[PDB]
């Protein structure tokens, strides 16, 4: 009861800000991990032969697209912020807006992380495959592009959830 009341009495603005920051942080972390995964294979292939640098750069660009989408989502969330008035600090509208912001941020961050990991693994495999044979680069690039859609879907879901903000 008293513990439950204290839990229900937590400030929603803090949770909303935490989710907003966490979305960008997780997107950046996932993009960096995918970039490193792709870069290891790209550097190995270049050491083997520098002929496929242009083909390899596509994986890096795709990985950075996740970071770009995360940054866009973070900017949108920052735009979604309000003044947080003292009177409505515990109003139902404020609590709903904070919960929606936190949920959208968590969803965006998790989707960005998953998409970044998948893209990094796909690019790491694709660079080695291209080093084995340049004829298979087209199919590998198509597969990577198809797998990159996870981040786009997560961003779409986060944008849809962002419309729920109604902080007075």
């Amino acid at each position: 009861s008293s513990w439950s009341r204290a839990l229900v009495k937590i400030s929603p603005y803090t949770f909303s800000a935490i989710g907003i920051a966490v979305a960008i942080g997780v997107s950046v972390l996932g993009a960096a991990w995918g970039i490193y995964i792709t870069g290891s294979s790209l550097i190995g292939a270049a050491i083997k032969a520098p002929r496929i640098t242009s083909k390899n750069l596509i994986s890096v660009i795709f990985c950075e697209a996740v970071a770009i989408y995360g940054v866009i989502v973070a900017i949108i969330l920052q735009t979604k912020l309000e003044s947080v008035p003292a009177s409505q600090i515990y109003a139902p509208e404020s609590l709903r807006a904070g919960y929606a912001i936190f949920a959208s941020g968590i969803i965006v961050g998790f989707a960005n992380l998953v998409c970044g990991l998948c893209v990094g693994i796909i690019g790491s495999s694709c660079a080695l495959s291209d080093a084995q044979n340049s004829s298979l680069f087209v199919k590998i690039l198509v597969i990577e592009i198809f797998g990159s859609a996870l981040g786009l879907f997560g961003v779409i879901v986060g944008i849809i959830m962002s419309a729920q903000a109604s902080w007075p």
Partner: protein
């Protein structure tokens, strides 16, 4: 899964590229492969075990003397590294995985390592110790390949023992006591004194079934060639080399097989 990208990715890519590029000429190719392997310097332990594989044979050869100075001519860094006669054996007991065990198992020195047959027995014991050490480093799909190689060596030794080395005290008990499913079911080969008996013993493993076939070739050779030739023939399985896995040993084995094929080519 992410550990491969965390570390070892560049080395794995370089090894894959070198293997894909692969296909006194034999000596030159062996020297080039050894240089490529050395220039590559977690995976450190795997490389050490892979080198120790041939280093066991190199140390066994160096254990002679008896024209011992000729061992410098075959100082291939791939297997004949300097870092890898009981007084000298104790000194050589360091920097090798199988050496500490062979110090006690082969404490008789030349008495248990006579160049006629007992030297081969000591080499087989060292190979068994090295195989056990390699199998100890479990965690990857290479455990199956290592087990297959050890089984092939043990079965070839057992076949050689039953063929003619039985008169050299390589009896049924010696088929596993000195001659290096095999780690659990090698007892079936203790009574395979005939080629038909060898085929019947191989029938206990359906994958090993029909591998012996007429046994005119492969099984015809003594020492460790009988079932090792079966592994050489089936090495097309090793040619798969699925990605994101330890393939350094596979690349080394492929390079060794290519060198052996080039040597067997010789003057056409």
């Amino acid at each position: 899964a992410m550990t491969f990208n965390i570390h070892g990715g560049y080395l794995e890519a370089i090894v894959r590229g070198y293997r894909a590029g692969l296909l006194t000429i034999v000596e030159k190719c062996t020297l080039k492969l050894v240089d490529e392997y050395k220039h590559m310097l977690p995976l450190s332990t795997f490389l050490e075990y892979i080198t120790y594989g041939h280093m066991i044979d190199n140390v066994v050869l160096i254990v002679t003397g008896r024209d011992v100075q000729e061992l410098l001519e075959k100082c291939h860094p791939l297997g004949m590294f300097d870092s890898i006669m009981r007084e000298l054996y104790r000194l050589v007991l360091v920097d090798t995985p199988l050496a500490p065990y062979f110090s006690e198992c082969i404490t008789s020195e030349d008495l248990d390592d006579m160049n006629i047959e007992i030297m081969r027995n000591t080499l087989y014991k060292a190979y068994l110790e090295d195989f056990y050490k390699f199998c100890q480093k479990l965690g990857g799909a290479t455990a199956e390949i290592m087990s297959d190689l050890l089984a092939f060596e043990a079965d070839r030794r057992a076949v050689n023992i039953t063929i003619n080395s039985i008169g050299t005290e390589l009896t049924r008990d010696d088929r596993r006591k000195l001659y290096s499913l095999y780690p659990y079911g090698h007892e079936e080969l203790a009574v395979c004194e005939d080629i038909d008996q060898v085929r019947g013993v191989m029938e206990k493993y359906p994958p090993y079934q029909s591998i012996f076939s007429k046994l005119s070739y492969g099984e015809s050779q003594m020492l460790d060639k009988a079932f090792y030739e079966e592994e050489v023939k089936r090495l097309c399985l090793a040619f798969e080399q699925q990605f994101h896995y330890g393939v350094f040993f596979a690349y080394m084995r492929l390079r060794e097989q290519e060198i052996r094929n080039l040597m067997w080519i010789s003057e056409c």
